[PDB]
Amino acid sequence: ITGTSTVGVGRGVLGDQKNINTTYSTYYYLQDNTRGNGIFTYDAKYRTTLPGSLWADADNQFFASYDAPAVDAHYYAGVTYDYYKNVHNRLSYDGNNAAIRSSVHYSQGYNNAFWNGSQMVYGDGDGQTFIPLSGGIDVVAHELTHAVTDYTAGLIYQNESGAINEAISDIFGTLVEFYANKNPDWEIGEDVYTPGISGDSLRSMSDPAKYGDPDHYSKRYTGTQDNGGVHINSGIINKAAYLISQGGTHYGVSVVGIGRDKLGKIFYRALTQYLTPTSNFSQLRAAAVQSATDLYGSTSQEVASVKQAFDAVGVK
Ligand SMILES: [Ca+2]
Ligand SMILES: [Ca+2]
Ligand SMILES: [Ca+2]
Ligand SMILES: [Zn+2]
């Protein structure tokens, strides 16, 4: 909508207070004009028609519990925008400042979030398995990263290329969490998963096997569930990325860690310059090796670590 840029205040899903960029025209709308062509947050109103209504508020204060998921979806989209811009010189998901749109209160008790090809969508969870999924920055950045992948490598969402797609989202999701720097970790979705159980998460990058995901190629899932195991086999690549950043010895193979920034640089380069729709894990290794060579040189520690990490997970 046409209006003037204003600044509201509210609380997010975890009861934390934050400022949000809004637009004023009769009502205060969840419309951030300060980033690219804007960030727009909508209310799906417990239904499944998308996007629903541009979020409108009478007084520019967002402290109702109904408000909380919207506050977080909006705020975290802005953080993710800032990460891509400041860290990788990328303007929104398409690289040309495309508008970022999110819908919250999708369906009733919906325990998931997704990119639907055009926008992000977040359920409120059932209160048992999940609370409102936009409460997790790693979740928000995970979904927005799907948009990035779609516009770049375009990895097909099935089998090995699908697992790479998923891993990229977990990786950047985590890197965004580290960038905002509020109790970051290498787990996915801990902030919004199982309110009754402390210390767990949906998936682990440091130790995929904790939640029954493979951590080595020999353990790859080859069935047809989960689009041929896109959320399962991603564990193999998640583990590799973790090793590249943090180092360690895995099934007897040692990796010298090079840190999160270099990890981000190598994978961002692979994603935008080398990966294709049909890339398999082996092609990922080659893409990451070439990225590292471009950035740091053929004989660098960075190249050696990429190689070691892929070795550790049994990807040749
Ligand atoms: Ca209000
Ligand atoms: Ca996390
Ligand atoms: Ca929990
Ligand atoms: Zn995903």
Side-chain angles (χ1 to χ4, degrees):
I1 52 86
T2 306
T4 188
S5 298
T6 54
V7 182
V9 53
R11 274 182 308 259
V13 170
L14 301 189
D16 57 322
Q17 186 173 296
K18 60 199 70 184
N19 291 337
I20 45 175
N21 294 111
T22 60
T23 297
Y24 171 78
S25 186
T26 306
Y27 287 90
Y28 298 87
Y29 290 93
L30 291 182
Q31 176 181 135
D32 176 3
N33 310 124
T34 72
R35 294 173 167 108
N37 299 317
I39 302 176
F40 300 81
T41 303
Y42 294 82
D43 192 3
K45 300 172 182 184
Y46 306 133
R47 314 270 305 173
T48 61
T49 64
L50 294 177
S53 313
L54 189 64
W55 193 287
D57 183 277
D59 69 358
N60 212 18
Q61 290 175 225
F62 300 82
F63 293 106
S65 62
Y66 191 80
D67 298 343
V71 162
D72 274 349
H74 200 63
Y75 182 94
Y76 294 142
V79 172
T80 306
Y81 177 99
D82 289 354
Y83 168 83
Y84 277 106
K85 181 175 179 286
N86 299 323
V87 179
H88 302 291
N89 190 46
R90 188 189 188 74
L91 306 176
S92 195
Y93 53 87
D94 69 340
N96 189 51
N97 270 152
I100 294 164
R101 301 187 196 282
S102 305
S103 300
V104 300
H105 296 303
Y106 178 81
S107 197
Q108 303 184 19
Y110 185 78
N111 288 315
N112 224 327
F114 57 94
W115 173 260
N116 77 342
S118 307
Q119 62 161 296
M120 290 168 295
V121 182
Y122 303 90
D124 293 317
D126 64 9
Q128 300 161 12
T129 304
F130 281 103
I131 60 169
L133 285 89
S134 62
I137 186 173
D138 57 357
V139 174
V140 173
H142 178 105
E143 299 309 341
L144 193 67
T145 291
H146 276 311
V148 173
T149 290
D150 286 1
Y151 272 87
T152 57
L155 290 149
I156 292 157
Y157 202 72
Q158 189 178 352
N159 306 320
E160 288 194 8
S161 67
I164 298 170
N165 192 311
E166 268 304 311
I168 294 290
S169 280
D170 284 348
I171 292 163
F172 288 104
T174 293
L175 291 174
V176 168
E177 186 175 295
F178 273 96
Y179 170 81
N181 194 28
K182 301 196 173 189
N183 301 310
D185 53 46
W186 296 87
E187 314 287 292
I188 310 305
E190 60 289 353
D191 286 347
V192 290
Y193 186 67
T194 59
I197 308 168
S198 76
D200 63 341
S201 68
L202 192 61
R203 282 184 294 284
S204 171
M205 297 185 71
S206 47
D207 183 11
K210 187 157 88 167
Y211 303 110
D213 300 313
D215 60 3
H216 193 276
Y217 197 69
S218 62
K219 293 176 173 172
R220 67 193 173 287
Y221 173 77
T222 62
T224 62
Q225 303 194 80
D226 177 44
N227 293 121
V230 298
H231 294 97
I232 300 167
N233 287 338
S234 65
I236 292 159
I237 304 309
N238 287 348
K239 183 68 180 184
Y242 173 83
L243 290 164
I244 292 172
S245 182
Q246 302 305 110
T249 306
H250 175 72
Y251 296 99
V253 171
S254 286
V255 185
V256 183
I258 63 175
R260 285 181 309 265
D261 291 353
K262 289 179 183 178
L263 170 71
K265 282 181 175 177
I266 291 165
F267 272 68
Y268 182 84
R269 189 177 188 82
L271 177 64
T272 62
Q273 305 198 198
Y274 294 104
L275 292 168
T276 74
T278 57
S279 298
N280 60 40
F281 278 13
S282 187
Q283 294 169 306
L284 172 59
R285 175 186 175 128
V289 167
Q290 187 58 56
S291 295
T293 301
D294 289 353
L295 291 168
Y296 305 108
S298 149
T299 57
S300 67
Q301 176 59 259
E302 294 80 354
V303 163
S305 294
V306 170
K307 286 183 181 177
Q308 279 291 280
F310 286 95
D311 285 350
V313 296
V315 168
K316 308 178 183 189

